[PDB]
Amino acid sequence: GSKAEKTLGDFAAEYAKSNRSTCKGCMEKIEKGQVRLSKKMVDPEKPQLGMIDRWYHPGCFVKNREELGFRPEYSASQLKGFSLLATEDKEALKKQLPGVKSEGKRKGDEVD
Ligand SMILES: [Zn+2]
């Protein structure tokens, strides 16, 4: 099967469908109807349950980005489903954690 271009295959973004998600970045519950992010990794406080989709707030996932293992080549523009958020949230995620384009992600010479 073909490789993905919208995600690096390690972290995700969506609106919070529920208050059942809790931010591991500060240990407070994530609010329904606003953005929530997660990373896939084995939980370091309970490794026995294996790789989980560990949830974080829009501020907190940037605060621990370097613990989560982000690099500029694959910032918030490489989260799952990021493109389906509102334009103001897509801008605000990049404004805190922006991705490098110099790899040739969009030159204006792809489909044009
Ligand atoms: Zn938080």
Q: What's 91's domain CATH number?
A: 3.30.1740.10
Cα of 111 vs centre of ligand 1, distance in Å, is 39
DSSP state of 81: T
Is residue 76 within 8 Å of residue 99, measured between CB atoms? yes
| Residue 60 marked in a binding site | yes
| Residue 45 marked in a binding site | no
Is residue 14 within 8 Å of residue 36, measured between CB atoms? yes
Name every residue whose Cβ is closer than 8 Å to that of residue 110 and which is 6 or more positions away in sequence.
Answer: none
Domain range enclosing 73 = 1-112
Cα of 58 vs centre of ligand 1, distance in Å, is 8
- Residue 68 in 3-state DSSP? helix
Cα of 109 vs centre of ligand 1, distance in Å, is 39
CB count in 10 Å sphere of residue 96: 15
The values of phi and psi at residue 29, to 5°, are: -70, 140
Domain count, the chain: 1
CB count in 10 Å sphere of residue 41: 15
Compute CA 63 distance to the chain's CA centroid, rounded to the nearest angstrom: 12
